[PDB]
Amino acid sequence: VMATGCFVGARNASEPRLGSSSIAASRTAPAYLREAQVLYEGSTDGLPKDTPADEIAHYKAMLAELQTRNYAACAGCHQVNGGGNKAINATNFQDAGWQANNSSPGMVTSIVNGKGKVMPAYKDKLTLQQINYLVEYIRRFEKKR
Amino acid sequence: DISKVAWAWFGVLLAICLIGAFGNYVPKLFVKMLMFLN
Amino acid sequence: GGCFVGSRDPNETRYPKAPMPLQNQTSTLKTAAQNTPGAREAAALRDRVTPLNLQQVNEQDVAGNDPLGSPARVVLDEGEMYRDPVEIYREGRALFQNNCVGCHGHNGCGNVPRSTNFTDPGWQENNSDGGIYSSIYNGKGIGNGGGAMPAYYNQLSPQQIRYLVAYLRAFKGRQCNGLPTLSDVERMVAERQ
Amino acid sequence: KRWYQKLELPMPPERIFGAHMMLIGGLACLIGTYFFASMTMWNDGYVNLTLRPRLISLGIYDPYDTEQIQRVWLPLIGEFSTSKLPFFGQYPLTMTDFRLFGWGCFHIGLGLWLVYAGAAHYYGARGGATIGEIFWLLPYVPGLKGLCQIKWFTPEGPWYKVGLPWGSFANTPWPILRRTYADALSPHTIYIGLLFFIWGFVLWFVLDKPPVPLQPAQVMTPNGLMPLEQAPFPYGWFDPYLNQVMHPMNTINGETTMCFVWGVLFVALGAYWWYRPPRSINITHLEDTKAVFHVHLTAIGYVSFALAIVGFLALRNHPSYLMLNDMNVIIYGKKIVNPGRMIHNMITFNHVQVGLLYVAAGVFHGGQYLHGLNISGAYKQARSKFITWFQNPDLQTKIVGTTMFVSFVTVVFGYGMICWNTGAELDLNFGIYQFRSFRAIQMDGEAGNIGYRVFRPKNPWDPTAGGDWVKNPDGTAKLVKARNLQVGDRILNEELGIGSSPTYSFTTIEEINYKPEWGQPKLYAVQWGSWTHFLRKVNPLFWVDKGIWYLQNQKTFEATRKADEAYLAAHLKAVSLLNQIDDAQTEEAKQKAQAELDKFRPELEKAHANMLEWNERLASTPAVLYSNLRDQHRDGEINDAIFFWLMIGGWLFGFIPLLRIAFHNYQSPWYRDFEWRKQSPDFPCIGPVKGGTCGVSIQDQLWFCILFSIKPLSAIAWYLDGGWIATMMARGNEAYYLTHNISHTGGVFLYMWNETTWIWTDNHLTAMLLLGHLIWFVSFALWFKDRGSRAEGGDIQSRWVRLMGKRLGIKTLQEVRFPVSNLATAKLWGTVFFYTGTFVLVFLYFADGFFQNR
Amino acid sequence: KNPDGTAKLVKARNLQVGDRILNEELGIGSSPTYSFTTIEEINYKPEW
Amino acid sequence: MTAILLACLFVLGGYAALWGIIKFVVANTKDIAAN
Amino acid sequence: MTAILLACLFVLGGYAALWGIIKFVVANTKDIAAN
Amino acid sequence: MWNVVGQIISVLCFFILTVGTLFGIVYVSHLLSRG
Ligand code: 2GO
Ligand code: CLA
Ligand SMILES: CC(C)CCCCCCCCCCCC(=O)OC[C@H](OC[C@H](C[N+](C)(C)C)C(=O)O)OC(=O)CCCCCCCCCCCC(C)C
Ligand SMILES: CNCCOP(=O)(O)O[C@H](COC(=O)CCCCCCCCCCCC(C)C)OC(=O)CCCCCCCCCCCC(C)C
Ligand SMILES: CNCCOP(=O)(O)O[C@H](COC(=O)CCCCCCCCCCCC(C)C)OC(=O)CCCCCCCCCCCC(C)C
Ligand SMILES: CNCCOP(=O)(O)O[C@H](COC(=O)CCCCCCCCCCCC(C)C)OC(=O)CCCCCCCCCCCC(C)C
Ligand SMILES: CC(C)CCCCCCCCCCCC(=O)OC[C@@H](OC(=O)CCCCCCCCCCCC(C)C)OP(=O)(O)OCCN
Ligand code: HEC
Ligand code: HEC
Ligand SMILES: [Ca+2]
């Protein structure tokens, strides 16, 4: 005997919405990416018309709070679909060469710290668990070649 | 077949141990005795 | 092992460069060859081949200790940065060969797992010069001293990171046989840096 | 067994003499070739690089020499058929190449002559010797037997073939000759005095570097004739790296004046001994060369150690090595970072190695002379105090046991402090304790206006405490500007952008408005956590260094202190004014506050300029003991304190087996209790009795000293080369090290990985890495309690192979017996392998270049 | 060469077996002990 | 010169220190044998 | 399944091959004592 | 001033616990093996 289980602690997650485990949500890809898309887009508008009433209004409250801390949404630098803006030098997430030459762990700190001149730091805006969700959503923008 | 001397050393090391634990886990899980919180 | 090293390449002169300044480049105190038979050919030859900013730099001159060396405040003037290919090549290949080959390969195509690969066009197109400075200065990934891509803010100067930034853009679209040459740097600079 | 035991002491004087003379001639020939390999047509390598700073300081290697030569001693000098100066007339030669060539040829001519003469004393000793026994693999050539049967060096012969006509030193009737080694101590040191004069005259008149105070007013440079004090380094006395005129005894002209100072002193001490030679009863047994061999070999080892210390400090920042950094040093195609310091570090660590090896060996040879006294029954009769002072076994156990204790305490302190601070730097939660890191946040200037959310406790001092986030009057979480942080505040780790400390959530402000004693001229809020920064002061050398240094720099130290104090007051008042602004509430009250910080801005600017410039001046003062890569003061560090404790404790750990050799070569307290006695100096054991007895002999104690000493020797290598020795995991780029202006390459383990990034850039260095790693672990095959297994299995192999030979018809296979190393020869070769494996890998750490910030 | 005397640049498509190219025209600094790469096989497509 | 003398003296004082320690132990445990 | 079967068959084949060698040696050196 | 004192107390405790634990390993080794 030893690991009587293993005392690793409780998992950090995002905000709780009543009646729907947030800890669980943070490991279930379809839940975490729904919250990543909300953060990414700055609205609840592109969310599946199947979204529940409680969900759609919890997201809005999340956004409204973030709007008071001058949070700037990811889309529209990077667009709703990726592959940003050459003008602004905003990264194109659809590109496979950009995707292969980034690890997901590495990507994290570039969102936390910001990246050179224009891409802003998000360490005081978002939690490290909300950055993890966004790294996962950006992964799904990849196209071939 | 332990000595008293050794038992007593063992009690003294049990104290340091628990004193340390109390400082590590008491402010965190109760929100009090805030001088040792991290 | 000893003595039977080769002949030295005639193109690598030993003719001496001026000494590294004692004064800090960030000082607020007071700021920042002859005609002898072959001395002019040797000076002209040292002016292309022997690097001037290879040595670790004074401790007050490192980018984290420089008032204008943070990613937010550094000056990336494209005219000064892509001015001289001799210079980008002279400096960035010495710095790169020393510091960066270990993890990014002798070809600069990636050695350590997940490491960058500077020949990749998709990676080139989606990075700014200022972006490249940030990741050298900060490192990439979570960890003490940067992550798996280590931080350089103690270690390198802002001027040393800028030679590195310009050199790294000579990797674009090259094959996986060693490092960019003098004419890779020059074709990179002609096609607008 | 005896193959390395062919030549054992005592020997007769003519044979020692003659072999030393022959070896001296041989070394002069090797140096002569090193002079040839220094010529400018070759690549840089490690051999020619370790001599170039010295040849620059001598004037023989000239860095600014460009012209090519075509006639210099006699009419045939560009290039010519069959070289004209054989194998060298292919390349362009300069004057430094010719100077090098000539000094090479001179060292090979003297060397060959000394080899011949040494042979005359060595073999004319024995009355002569025939050509085929001198050269010995000369009778194998056929049709040249007759040639190899002549007798050279005979006592009788015509002038070009004599050895010693009288047969021995003792028989030759030259009444100047001294007759005992103590009487010879006087001529040997007059002789060394004469050598010092030779060197001084060669430096003054051949190399043209006269002695202080007779140095020239003018000296020729590549830019013309200049005055000595403005002429740069190799030519004159101006140091162009540090921007100063050199002290006269920091030039080579200083070294030529010491040639005469030391030569006069040796001549006079030798003439004193001529008249009152050493005569003590405590010295008389030292005429036997077995006994003196101990004394001389251990002394020589100490001399090497002192060469390392003296050479390291004296030459760490000297222009001869820094000049290397200006040449364009390329080794196995690379380009080295700071070659100056790399070659300097190699030479001093070379000498430290030699130091250890000769102190350890000299003591072993000592234990051999004592063991023989015990075997022969004479130990008990010895009359010298240097033996009898240590004859008592109760005193020996107290000597050994108290140095074991002193070792225990210093090594527990050092290694325990290393472990503590590596725990601190890693933030490790042990359940019973959370280790915490150093973190800093700037409180002044523009940084001081960045806000954070703060959890602020109510009253730290009382338990049943509680805290709350700092809010606004309406109840929202207010952002606290770093300038306004207080002791006790907690800021979330995630918002400072810190991963890497997942077991806790907050960083705590422990000190505010902190200004490093030695570091950046900035103001911080700090978490000290568990990081022991006070431990730098737990070093006697911190205080001596900083005291001498304060006394020498006391006025600028005082003006710096006062400029800091004025800036702190001005920053504090700026923070008041900024706060009144931020807490205005009336567009009028805002506007008026803003007006008053505007008229106080100038003079905050001035206090900051004043402070910055005084701090820059103070940090440019000359070093005493602890220095920069320039030659400027640094304060002592945790690194320097740990090195200090580690030198005390780790050299005792290494040297305790030498004490055991000295006392217990024959009987130790374990042995005496069983009534045992060590019968030889090299037996491996006496078997399994009493639990096991491997490793008690003096040859084994010798091997243990060497392995144990690997540890202080690696601490020295890591320290020389720029590693952090005070923790295991330290990285160069982190907040503690940048705020305190510290440069390092590693952290014990972290250094191993970080330097190897540099090693990997060189294919020749990585091949050395692979091989040196193969050598070490094979030593484990020889050191483990395993030799019986190996002999039993080698017998199975022998049998099989002879079977195959019978079955197959192979006569040479049919009697094969594999040799298996017995126990003593295994411990010897295992130690040889363990030592050469490690120190070929340590060479690599020096040879990747030196990367500490300058 | 050219007829004009200056070094002809051979396009990679026309490399033949036997050809030597200078290591330093290819940027290789890791092999300082030999001077040229030899082409030993042209139009090679990896089986896999 | 100053740093050279300091280092040297610090090593020489390392040996001198130890001897003194050892001398104190020997004198103050005279008449206790260590068996 | 095919991969699992191939890998297991190769491990048992190494054992079987060793048995065959070690028995080609025994059978044809039966007149010679090993020693 | 007060951080320093606090840190000295943790370091003391660590030395008391690690050296203390090491000697207990020796004592325990001793009781098993023999007395
Ligand atoms: C790090 C990159 C690379 C990898 C691939 C690597 C791996 C490994 C492995 C493996 C399977 O992964 C092994 C098994 C291994 C083996 C070895 N390596 Zn190794 N190795 C590398 C590289 C190197 C290098 C360059 C070197 C070794 C050196 C050595 C040596 C180690 C020889 C030895 O026994 O050394 C004891 C000394 C050590 C560990 C150095 C201690 C430094 C420190 C600063 C001393 C001061 C502080 C201490 C806490 C002690 C205080 C108390 C005291 C003074 C009494 C052997 C061949 C070797 C060395 O450290 O020798 C002292 C050496 O120089 N190695 N090594
Ligand atoms: C380089 C690693 C090395 C090698 C090759 C060996 C070899 C061997 N050991 Mg030794 N051993 C080693 C390390 C190694 N050991 C270590 C680290 C220890 C301590 C734990 C030991 C402890 C030890 C014990 C106690 C015993 C052995 C035994 C054996 C033999 C096994 C019988 C056999 O099965 O033949 C099969 C042979 C092989 C599988 C080896 C083929 C050989 C190699 C790889 C070529 C070797 C290259 C060499 C390093 C290069 C230098 C050559 C130079 C000219 C280029 C075998 C010859 C047994 C023995 O029988 O003794 C005679 C035995 O009893 N080993
Ligand atoms: C240091 C180097 C520069 C090389 C040195 C020179 C030689 C190089 C080339 C290799 C030489 C190999 C010679 C091996 C040999 O013949 O060994 C024979 C020998 O002694 C037995 C008799 C002498 N009785 C015993 C009669 C007095 C003899 O032959 O002279 O041995 C040993 O006993 C030592 C072991 C030698 C190793 C040979 C093993 C070869 C492996 C074969 C295994 C498999 C079979 C089936 C082929
Ligand atoms: C990255 N650069 C780091 C060095 O920077 P920088 O230039 O600032 O500073 C000097 C230190 O460098 C030395 O100078 C080391 C030379 C090593 C060769 C020399 C290493 C040898 C050390 C000791 C040798 C012991 C032998 C003889 C037993 O930093 C010093 O203060 C060192 C002073 C050494 C004195 C310590 C005294 C301890 C007493 C030992 C007692 C031993 C015995 C009782 C058995
Ligand atoms: C098989 N005979 C027994 C092996 O005897 P041991 O067990 O004694 O141990 C060796 C010992 O080394 C030394 O005591 C140094 C001596 C030479 C000095 C060394 C001098 C250095 C040499 C390098 C110099 C040359 C270079 C520079 C060119 O070490 C090892 O443990 C390593 C394993 C070696 C592999 C052995 C070879 C295999 C042969 C068995 C065949 C079996 C079957 C086919 C049936
Ligand atoms: C017989 N019973 C009685 C006592 O026996 P006893 O222990 O004296 O005897 C021997 C021999 O003395 C040596 O020990 C020879 C090397 C000395 C100079 C050495 C002469 C040749 C080797 C070195 C020189 C080579 C170069 C210079 C050409 O028994 C052994 O040590 C047997 C082991 C060696 C067998 C080879 C094992 C592996 C070979 C080396 C490979 C290892 C490498 C990975 C490092
Ligand atoms: C590689 C190795 C093998 C070679 C070793 C090199 C030896 C070099 C010798 C080191 C020479 C140092 C002198 C230069 C110097 O000290 O400079 C000036 C120094 O003036 C002096 O005192 C002059 C008197 C010097 C008379 C001493 C002779 C030394 C004897 C050597 C014995 C060696 C043994 C036997 C191991 O200035 P300050 O300290 O006052 O100011 C601080 C400097 N910031
Ligand atoms: C105002 C523009 C802007 C906004 C808002 C913005 N970004 Fe960026 N971002 C940029 C620009 C410009 C870059 C290019 C960075 C550089 O210089 O290399 C970039 C770069 C990146 C990269 C690539 C980083 C890397 O390491 O290679 C990621 C991932 C990224 N942004 C994610 C985000 C996410 C997630 C958000 C919102 C949470 C976001 N960005 C918000 C403009 C923006
Ligand atoms: C310890 C190994 C290591 C060293 C040393 C190292 N790197 Fe890297 N590097 C990496 C890894 C791993 C990545 C991939 C990071 C990620 O995405 O996870 C990387 C990525 C980068 C990137 C891309 C960053 C970005 O955001 O896209 C740049 C630029 C970089 N390295 C440059 C350099 C330069 C210049 C040097 C020398 C100064 C250097 N590297 C040294 C390992 C290393
Ligand atoms: Ca190094």
Sketch out chain A's domains with CATH numbers. Answer: 22-140 (1.10.760.10)
Which residues of chain E have a CB within 8 Å of the CB of D333? 29-30, 32
Contact residues on chain D for B28, CB-CB shorter than 8 A = 504
CA distance A40 to A139: 13
Element (DSSP H or E) covering residue D838: helix D823-847
Cβ atoms of residues A70 and A63 within 8 Å: no
Give the nearest chain A residue to C113 (CA atoms): A103
Shortest CA gap A82–chain D (Å): 26
Say if H and G touch: at least 3 Cβ pairs within 8 Å: no
Q: Is D151 helix (H, G, I), strand (E, B) or coil?
A: strand
Place of tokens 């017996």: D817
> Which residues of D participate in the annotated binding site for [4Fe-4S] cluster?
685, 694
Which residue type does D748 have?
V
SS3 state at A116: coil
Longest alpha-carbon distance in chain B: 44
| Residue D107 near residue D31 (C-beta atoms within 8 A) | yes
CA D493/CA C108 separation, integer angstroms: 35
Q: Which of residues 4-23 of E touch C (CB under 8 A)?
A: none
Please tell me the distance from the alpha carbon of residue G18 to that of residue G29, in angstroms, as a whole number: 17
Question: Chain B contacts of H27, Cβ < 8 Å?
Answer: 6
Closest partner residue to B13 (CB to CB) among H17, H31, H35 is: H17
Q: What spacing in Å lies between the alpha carbon of D191 and ligand 7's midpoint?
A: 24
β-pair partners for A17: A20
Of H7, H15, H19, the CB nearest to D532: H7
φ, ψ (nearest 5 deg) of residue D453: -85, 135
Contacts of E32 (CB under 8 A, 6+ apart): D332, D333
Write down how long chain C is: 193
Which token pair is A37? Answer: 């898309």
User: Which residues have a Cβ under 8 Å from the Cβ of D360 and sit 6 or more positions away?
Assistant: D301, D658, D702, D705, D706, D709
What token pair was written down for D32? 């002569």
Q: How far apart are CA A38 and CA A45, in angstroms?
A: 8
Pocket, ligand 2, Cβ cutoff 6 A: D 777-778, 780-781, 784, 786, 789-790, 793-794
CB contact, 8 Å: H5 with chain D? no
Closest CA to D539 of D623, D624, D634, D644: D644
Whether C37 contacts D710, CB under 8 Å: no
For an interface test with D, the pick among F10, F12, F15 (most D C-beta atoms closer than 10 Å) comes out as F10
Contacts of H14 in chain D (CB under 8 A): 416, 420
Q: Do B34 and D457 touch (CB under 8 A)?
A: yes
Residue closest by Cα to atom 11 of ligand 9: C115
For ligand 7, atom 7, which residue shows the shortest CA distance? D311
Bridge partner residues of D452 (DSSP)? D480
Which of D416, D433, D510 is opposite residue H15, by nearest beta carbon? D416
Best of D494, D496, D500, D504 to disrupt the A interface (most A CBs within 10 Å) is: D494
**Atom from ligand 5 closest to the CA of residue D825:** 14
Rounded distance between C-alpha atoms, residue C140 and residue D332, angstroms: 32
Tokens of D784: 């483990």
Chain C CB contacts of D46 below 8 Å: 2
| 3-state class (DSSP) for residue D740 | coil
Q: Ligand 8: residues within 6 Å at CB?
A: A 72, 74, 77-78, 88-91, 102, 107, 110-111, 115-116, 118-120, 122, 134, 138; C 127-128, 130-131
Q: Whose CA is nearest to atom 23 of ligand 8?
A: A91
Number of neighbours of residue D135 by Cβ within 10 angstroms:
10
**Secondary structure of residue D444 in the 3-state scheme:** coil
Cβ <8 Å between D757 and C64: no
The tokens of F7 are what?
A: 């280092």
Query: In angstroms, what separates the C-alpha of C97 from chain D's closest C-alpha?
Result: 7
Which residues are CB-contacts of G7 (< 8 A; sequence separation ≥ 6)? Answer: none
Q: Among the atoms of ligand 1, which is closest to the Cα of residue D653? A: 55
Q: What is residue C116's three-state secondary structure?
A: coil
Chain D residues whose CB is inside 8 A of the E32 CB are: 332-333
d(CA D720, CA C57): 18
Instruction: Please give all residues whose beta carbon lies within 6 A of any atom in ligand 1, as ranges.
Output: D 411, 415, 418, 646, 649-650, 653, 710-712, 714-715, 718, 725, 748, 752-753, 756, 773, 776, 837-838, 841-842, 844-845
Question: Count of CB atoms within 10 A of residue D100's CB?
Answer: 23
Interhelix angle F2-27/D289-315, nearest 10 degrees:
130
Burial degree of D338 (CB within 10 A; 0-12, 13-18, 19+)? buried
Q: Do D470 and D454 meet the contact criterion of CB atoms below 8 Å apart?
A: yes
Q: Whose CA is nearest to atom 34 of ligand 9?
A: C100
A58 is in an annotated binding site: no
d(CA D161, CA B20): 86
User: In D160-184, which positions are buried (b, 16+ CB within 10 angstroms) versus exposed (e)?
Assistant: eebbbeeeebeeeeeeeeeeebbeb
Distance D688 CA to ligand 5 centre (A): 27
Tokens linked to D740: 């305190």
- According to the annotation, is A104 in a ligand binding site? no
**C164 close to ligand 9 (CB < 6 Angstrom):** yes
CA-nearest residue to H22 within chain D is: D412
Q: Name which residue sits closest to atom 23 of ligand 2, judged by CA.
A: D781
Alpha helices, DSSP H, located in chain H: 2-33
Q: Which residue has the tokens 């370091």?
A: H11
3-state helix, strand, coil in chain C (%, to 5): 40, 5, 60
Q: Is the dihedral of CA D817, D822, D827, D832 positive or negative?
A: negative
**DSSP 8-class letter at C185:** H
Ligand 6 centroid to Cα of residue D817, in Å, is: 13
Q: Quick check: helix, strand or coil at residue D259? A: helix
How far apart CA E29 and CA E23 sit, in angstroms, is: 8
**Closest-CA residue in chain E for C175?**
E26
What is the distance in angstroms between the Cα of B22 and the nearest Cα belonging to chain D? 7
- Cα separation, D837 vs C87, in Å, equals 42
* Spatial distance between the Cα atoms of D777 and D836, rounded to a whole number of angstroms: 11
In residues, how long is chain D? 854
- Ligand 5 probe mutation, D777, D784, D792, D820, most atoms within 8 A of CB: D820
- H or E element that contains D467: strand D467-469
In this structure, how many other beta carbons lie within 10 angstroms of the beta carbon of residue D360?
24
| Closest ligand 6 atom to Cα of D778 | 44
Which alpha helices (DSSP H) does chain C contain, by range? 39-49, 78-81, 85-99, 101-104, 121-125, 129-138, 158-168, 182-190
Residues within 5 Å of ion ligand 10, judged at the Cβ atom? D 721, 848
Whether residue D181 contacts residue D287, with contact meaning beta carbons closer than 8 Å, is answered with yes
The residue whose CA is least distant from atom 25 of ligand 1 is D841
D496 and A113 in contact by Cβ < 8 A?
no
The minimum CA-CA distance between E31 and chain D, rounded to whole Å, is 8
Contact D309, D381 (CB under 8 A): no
Q: What is the number of the ligand 4 atom nearest to the C-alpha of D852? A: 1
